Design a protein around this nucleic acid. Structure first.
Lengths: 158, 206, 100, 263
RNA sequence: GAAACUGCGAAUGGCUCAUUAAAUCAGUUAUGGUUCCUUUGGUCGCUACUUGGAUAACUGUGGUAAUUCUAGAGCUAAUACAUGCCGACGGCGCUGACUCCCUUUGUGUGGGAUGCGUGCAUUUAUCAGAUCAAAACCAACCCGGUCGCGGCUUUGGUGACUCUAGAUAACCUCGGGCCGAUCGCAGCCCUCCGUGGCGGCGACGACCCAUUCGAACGUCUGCCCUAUCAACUUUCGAUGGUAGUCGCCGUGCCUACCAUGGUGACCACGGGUGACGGGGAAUCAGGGUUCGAUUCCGGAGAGGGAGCCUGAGAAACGGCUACCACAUCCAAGGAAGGCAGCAGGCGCGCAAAUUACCCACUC
């Protein structure tokens, strides 16, 4: 919040510039930084916390340098010990045709999760879309979070 | 020789993989430019598709922008003072993208003093009056002093730059890739970027 | 003037190899002592250094200044007809012709 | 290994609609690089040797072309494997005849003779719209033609008419409901009908629904629809059978009843 | 019209199945993360009536036991190699000596001597991108009118761009971006007697868009036997973050600093395979079992490993350099080599054809 330059190099959004002319503000002041953000398409909506926020993240869909294309998928949040990335589980049934019966299977995906989502928990349901390769094992990025079709965080009044 | 392939290294599970084929030519890599400060030395290489690429080994001069004033000019490069990635690059004086450098203030000072009709880099009267006062004051029929309110009411520079101009050097940041373009070229440090790197420079050695 | 020669075993001398021995060099298009059979070909082959010794099969020499005496046949014989020029400015330069 | 581009074609690998025999040979003509895709063209040698039968061998085709008799879109072509395709005109001024390439309702090029005043124009589908330097607008067609200064009402998926002596636009048809079209790919290849609905998806493929003269209904991806007339009437003459695609039982019954094929 | 120089092709075709178990391969999708000879269509006006020197074929003299080995001497060309005008600057922005009019300045004007930059590509920085709901005061005015009221305007496109087009300040590659010192057929029209040109048909060539043929990298789901294989990976990069280098481009691809991650009983990690994958083949009431080196499609490799030149395209073997294993000739100094192409031979073994004829057909 109050400080974000925790790295050895200065952190800023590309395409935003601050004028060093007409700088007078009197006894008070206003934000020296305007905010860059965009529409993703496909009927998704940009979070309020991306527009009203102050974080820097170049891999963010709403406020960074990525294009959402190809497949849209969903899965269950299962681990989150990395920084700005999480692991999700996908479960399915496989048909074996000699018998007339099914077999249970799973796979894991590592995905990139930006700030603007900040109340996610293990067992939440998440929707993701493809990007260019973002790191060695990461190809997908979080577009929406939900806990519909399941029990509450704490008691039923949540 | 050198190569940039994905298949020489292990998978998500920690398991090995065996080679699928010999090294291909499209997987190639080459040694680094390691560009120094010094009089121009550039070499050229042929690249995939028959195109050409330029590699700078020595550079003495660059193009820099003072974005606050919409002024850009060809300028001498003096020294390197900070590098976010590795300290051996400033100890050996190597020039790369987002490196922090010192540049000659003169062509910006000459543009400002002739545009605003005011002094900038001056200490005392002995470096104002004896020559070049005729840049500042001349006959100007119905353009003499009050019509320069279009200039004078917006002339004041930031205190952090007025302290740099008196020493004859400005801090700047490299924006081009010199080992790929053959050019060293960028912008003058200002505002909170200038406060950030002045704190980092002082906290390292001072 | 000394213009070159051949070793025993017939290997040629070439300029810039500063020894009395023979050596093996990787030759390429534009060097003497090699003629490429394909575009971009290079081959490694034996050549003799620049220094003259008793070992040579033959020395090549060219007369750069004549004496007062005549050497039999070699300096008696008058010049042949050669072949004339073919580029237009070359013809003008030979006969001192005007531009018109 | 594959160290560069290929330059042969095996006869069992060649496009099915050319109707090549099994036993004369191992190879087929590789179509010359050009305005139409390798799967979607007819090489000029297959038209002169196998369809029109003016030549018995590839050498008899070579010595027809080198005499400068054959024109495609009004230009003389000496290349025997040149890739002719949909809506092109071929003219043979020495025999006095003109042709246009159009699909038969079984999904293959028909021979279709035309009158010399209809041999003066062709129909083109729009692929791209863009702006170049100095703000000049550009158009691109299904057959690689580039046009400067198009009419600002001409949009994506529309059909334009061009005169062949000058290469400039004369008139156009908008893509909208109720216009006549022909199908140029998939299983419905070579059918004709009116556009009746367009269903759209953001990402992936749009789908068009089309209605027949006999009241049948069929659908395809939007990339397979070519518009050929404003409302009910086409801007080009059409081959025997007019795109109606009768079933194998109707085709049996007409073949018995009409006694055609020298019965 | 021999030879020779220059251009293009030789990266396709043909042969084999050793390696290879989420690898290859199949169906399905993506480049809004790249490159692209040729074809086809756009585009092609910021000494000059024609420049420079120098080699091959050829002529002439040689060296070595020996090879598609080559040296010294005398001549001469270009669409090879290297220079460089003319024509059509008349741009439009910025400076502003002076000058004229209402109002000494400021502020509204119209002229204007004189300088500087001024095509498309290239590197970096900055600017603008127009549209929506409702009134009331004040400075100064567009405009209909005069000393307070009506009424408005400006590239294109996608589901989505830090897209395309536009404006400003500089850079620029040079020896190291473009804008023709080239070749062949028929001749012409004239302040016109062989002159000023303008012009008909082409041929070849080159920077940049778009095509065509592709190539490369990535998404989702799919595999034979094994526990006498239960835990594995990890600055010797393992999983992730920030900045950079290198590369045609995305990316631990690699480097510095930091974090402590990632996979497994829904079988990881390890071992085996007389394992190249698929279209397919034999047998078969219904359900199945077994096979697929082999004419079509994809991959890999030219005795074994490694390195590299040329080019749009190769880590090429009918290209080159070296080590390792074989092996031919010699005057013992040296030189030359790769049939898993077609015929043919030896060895192996139960086990497999002629050292024939032709470009007539298909390409």
């Amino acid at each position: 919040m109050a400080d974000i330059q925790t790295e050895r190099a200065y952190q800023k959004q590309p395409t935003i510039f601050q004028n060093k002319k007409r700088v007078l503000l009197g006894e008070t002041g206003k934000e020296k930084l305007p905010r860059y953000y965009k529409n993703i398409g496909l009927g998704f909506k940009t979070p309020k916390e991306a527009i009203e926020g102050t974080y820097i993240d170049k891999k963010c869909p709403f406020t960074g340098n990525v294009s959402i294309r190809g497949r849209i998928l969903s899965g269950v949040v299962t681990k989150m010990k990395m920084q700005r990335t999480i692991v999700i589980r996908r479960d399915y049934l496989h048909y074996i045709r000699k018998y007339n019966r099914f077999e249970k299977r799973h796979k894991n995906m590592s995905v990139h999760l930006s700030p603007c989502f900040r109340d996610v928990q293990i067992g939440d349901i998440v929707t993701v879309g493809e990007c260019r390769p973002l790191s060695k094992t990461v190809r997908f990025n979080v577009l929406k979070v939900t806990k519909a079709a399941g029990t509450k965080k704490q008691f039923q009044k949540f | 020789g050198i190569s940039r392939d994905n298949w020489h290294k292990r998978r998500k599970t920690g398991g090995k993989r065996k080679p699928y084929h010999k090294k291909r030519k499209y997987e190639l890599g080459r040694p680094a430019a390691n560009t120094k400060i010094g009089p121009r030395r550039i070499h050229t290489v042929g690249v995939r598709g028959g195109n050409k690429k330029y590699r700078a080994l020595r550079l003495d001069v660059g193009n820099f922008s003072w974005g606050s004033e919409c002024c850009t000019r060809k300028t001498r490069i003096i020294d390197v003072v900070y590098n976010a990635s590795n300290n051996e690059l400033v100890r050996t004086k190597t020039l790369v993208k987002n490196c922090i450098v010192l540049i000659d203030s003169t062509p910006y000072r000459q543009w400002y003093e002739s545009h605003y009709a005011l002094p900038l880099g001056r200490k005392k009267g002995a470096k104002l009056t004896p020559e070049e006062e005729e840049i500042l004051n001349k006959k100007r029929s119905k353009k003499i002093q009050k019509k320069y309110d279009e200039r004078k009411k917006n002339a004041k520079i930031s205190s952090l730059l007025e302290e740099q101009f008196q020493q004859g050097k400005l801090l700047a940041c490299i924006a081009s890739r010199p080992g790929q373009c053959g050019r060293a070229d960028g912008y003058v440090l200002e505002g909170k970027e200038l406060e950030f790197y002045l704190r980092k420079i002082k906290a390292r050695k001072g | 003037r000394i213009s070159g020669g051949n070793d025993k075993q017939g290997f040629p001398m070439k300029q810039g190899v500063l020894t009395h021995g023979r050596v093996r060099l990787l030759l390429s298009k534009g060097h003497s002592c090699y003629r490429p059979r394909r575009t971009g070909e290079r081959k490694r082959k034996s050549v003799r250094g620049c220094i003259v010794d008793a070992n040579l099969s033959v020395l090549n020499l060219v007369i750069v200044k004549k004496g007062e005496k005549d050497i039999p046949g070699l300096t008696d014989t008058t010049v042949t007809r050669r072949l004339g020029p073919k580029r237009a400015s070359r013809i003008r330069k030979l006969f001192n012709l005007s531009k018109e | 290994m594959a160290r560069g581009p290929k330059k042969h074609l095996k006869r069992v690998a060649a496009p099915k609609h050319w109707m090549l025999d099994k036993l004369t040979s191992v190879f087929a003509p590789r179509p010359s690089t050009g305005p139409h895709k390798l799967r979607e063209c007819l090489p000029l040698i297959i038209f002169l040797r196998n369809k029109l039968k003016y030549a018995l061998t590839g050498d008899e085709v070579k010595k027809i072309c080198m005499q400068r008799f054959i024109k495609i879109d009004g230009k003389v072509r000496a290349d025997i494997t040149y890739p002719a395709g949909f809506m092109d005109v071929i003219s043979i001024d020495k025999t006095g005849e003109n042709f246009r390439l159009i699909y038969d309702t079984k999904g293959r090029f028909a021979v279709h003779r035309i009158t010399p005043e209809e041999a003066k124009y062709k129909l083109c589908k729009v692929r791209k719209i863009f702006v170049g330097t100095k703000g000049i607008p550009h158009l691109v067609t299904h057959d690689a033609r580039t046009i400067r200064y198009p009419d600002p009402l001409i949009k994506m998926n529309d059909t334009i008419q061009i005169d062949l002596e000058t290469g400039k636009i004369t008139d156009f048809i908008k893509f909208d409901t109720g216009n006549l079209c022909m199908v140029t790919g998939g299983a419905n290849l070579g059918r004709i009908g009116v556009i009746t609905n367009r269903e759209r998806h953001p990402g992936s493929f749009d789908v068009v629904h089309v209605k027949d003269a006999n009241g049948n209904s069929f659908a395809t991806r939007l990339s397979n629809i070519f518009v050929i007339g404003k409302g009910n009437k086409p801007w080009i003459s059409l081959p025997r059978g007019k795109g109606i695609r009768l079933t194998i039982a109707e085709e049996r019954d007409k073949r018995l009843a009409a006694k055609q094929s020298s019965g």
